[PDB]
Design a protein around this nucleic acid. Structure first.
Ligand SMILES: Nc1ncnc2c1ncn2[C@@H]1O[C@H](COP(=O)(O)CP(=O)(O)OP(=O)(O)O)[C@@H](O)[C@H]1O
Ligand SMILES: N=C(N)NCCCCN
Length: 402
RNA sequence: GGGCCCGUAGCUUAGCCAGGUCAGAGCGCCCGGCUCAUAACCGGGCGGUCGAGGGUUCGAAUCCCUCCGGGCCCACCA
């Protein structure tokens, strides 16, 4: 007998699968043909700005030889090897040898690595593996079996029947709101009571019927029963880093701010908020690094109404990814609020010269602002996987748009 | 005491000094859409009679007259 971590990534298509499904089909066979799969499989999300999830599951077979073969099959039948955007990869790391990968995984969640850095690893520990085509999978693969989970969450992922593949998903929508209604926060980020959307029911080719996140088996269990939906074929719970901010980089730990990575910076507003056709807002804040601009895009919705209130001077904390040199707000902290006054010519009942008063002074008044200090985030429909929703953070000044 | 600018939908604005698609647009906004993808025009829609008052003219947002509201500059007195 042997304990071994299986890891899979990049296997679906722009019309194929959900890599998580294959990992389940691989689990099914392993569970009835080689041994026993231990605990819940993990769905680890890697760097989200990559030019993205991976799966892993700890098994216990008698013979790793066969183990590989089996998981290779599923990968040679239920995997879209046709498309060119799909280059699968598989790893089998001995239980012990897991932790010794946490770094490599950390590096593939917060930065950008090339296939070599992954081969270099498989080599350092001579790790049984499966490359297909380019096998750019082997990156996520390892990463998935090395991802550290200090803070984690769960996700109940349901799948439809193969024959019901392609059809538009039916479900008594409303049953998810009765849902969110009584478990929340417990089960969360599943719906948007504001933008009126049921965010956990994808509209893709993947067999994924629904997908409910929460913080406990208890909640997920109650939830799965409490909701009306089309027949559920398979169903599995995944431990994930979903909603953990496990990709942000602290400004207190890097000199430059490269593109394709996520951070958390503090700064003063320099250039006021503004729009562009599309509802897209922008504003430049001053920082330790220098001139850094922030985007508060439209899908961000109800967030913009908060972003536009920022005035030159305000001290704020921006949470987001850096692309096009801009930091895409996932959330923002209003540290201190800068006061702003306005000048006006007095009246009897105007200006008469450069130095020749009017009275002598101009009417200076302190206009009260509305925007207020605290943590503001983007509403669920706009939620990013890794992005940690505030309902989870323990800090004050939280404004949770449910 | 004189010299100016500026005022079009809730905002920010094309048009205006070459007066005859008397109304374009972006944001917001109401309503929908999209997402396993942070996302640099996603859609429609309501909405203005062009600061007010008057004159010119077949005709004015558009040229002219003044007023209100903002707001600026140069002299001068002392
Ligand atoms: N840090 C990183 N740097 C570079 N490539 C990375 C990376 N982390 C992951 N990758 C690679 O990016 C590719 C992701 O492909 P997929 O896994 O198909 C996207 P997915 O999001 O997993 O597919 P899906 O959208 O159907 O869920 C894989 O090659 C993965 O190994
Ligand atoms: N709750 C989920 N399973 N998914 C919600 C994703 C929302 C952003 N697409």
């Amino acid at each position: 007998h042997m304990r071994v971590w299986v890891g899979i990534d990049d296997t679906d298509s722009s019309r194929g699968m959900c890599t998580t499904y294959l990992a389940v089909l691989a689990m099914e066979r392993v569970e009835r043909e080689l041994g026993k799969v231990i605990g819940f499989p993990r769905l680890i999300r890697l760097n989200p700005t990559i030019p993205n999830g991976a799966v892993s599951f700890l098994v216990e077979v008698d013979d790793v030889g066969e183990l590989v073969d089996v998981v290779n099959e599923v990968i040679i039948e239920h995997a879209m090897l046709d498309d060119e955007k799909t280059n699968p990869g598989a790893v089998f790391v001995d239980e012990e040898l897991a932790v010794k990968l946490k770094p490599f995984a950390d590096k593939a969640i917060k930065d950008v690595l090339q296939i070599d850095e992954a081969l270099f690893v498989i080599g350092k520990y001579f790790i049984p593996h499966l490359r297909h085509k380019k096998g750019r999978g082997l990156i996520g693969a390892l990463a998935a079996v090395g991802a550290e989970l200090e803070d984690f969450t769960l996700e109940l992922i349901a799948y439809r029947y193969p024959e019901r593949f392609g059809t538009e998903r039916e479900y008594d929508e409303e049953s998810f709101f009765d849902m969110d209604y009584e478990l929340y926060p417990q089960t969360f980020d599943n719906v948007d009571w504001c933008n009126d959307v049921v965010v956990c029911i994808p509209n893709t080719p993947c067999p994924v019927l629904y997908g409910i996140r929460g913080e406990s088996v208890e909640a997920l269990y109650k939830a799965m029963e409490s909701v009306k939906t089309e027949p559920v074929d398979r169903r599995m719970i995944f431990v994930t880093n979903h909603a953990t901010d496990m990709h942000l980089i602290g400004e207190e730990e890097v000199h430059r701010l490269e593109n394709y990575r996520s951070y958390r910076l503090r700064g003063r507003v320099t250039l006021e908020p503004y729009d562009i056709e599309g509802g897209h807002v922008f504003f430049e804040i001053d920082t330790k690094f220098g001139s850094v601009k922030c985007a508060a895009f439209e899908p961000t919705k109800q967030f913009r109404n908060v972003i536009r209130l920022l005035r030159k001077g305000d001290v704020v904390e921006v949470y987001g990814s850096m692309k096009k040199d801009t930091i895409n707000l996932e959330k923002i902290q209003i540290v201190e609020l800068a006061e702003i006054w306005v000048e006006k010519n007095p009246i009897c009942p105007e200006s008469a010269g450069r130095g020749q008063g009017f009275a002598d002074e101009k009417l200076r008044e302190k206009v009260e602002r509305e925007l207020q200090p605290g943590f503001y985030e983007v509403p669920p429909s706009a939620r990013r996987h890794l992005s940690k929703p505030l309902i989870r953070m323990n800090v004050e000044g939280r404004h949770i748009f449910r």
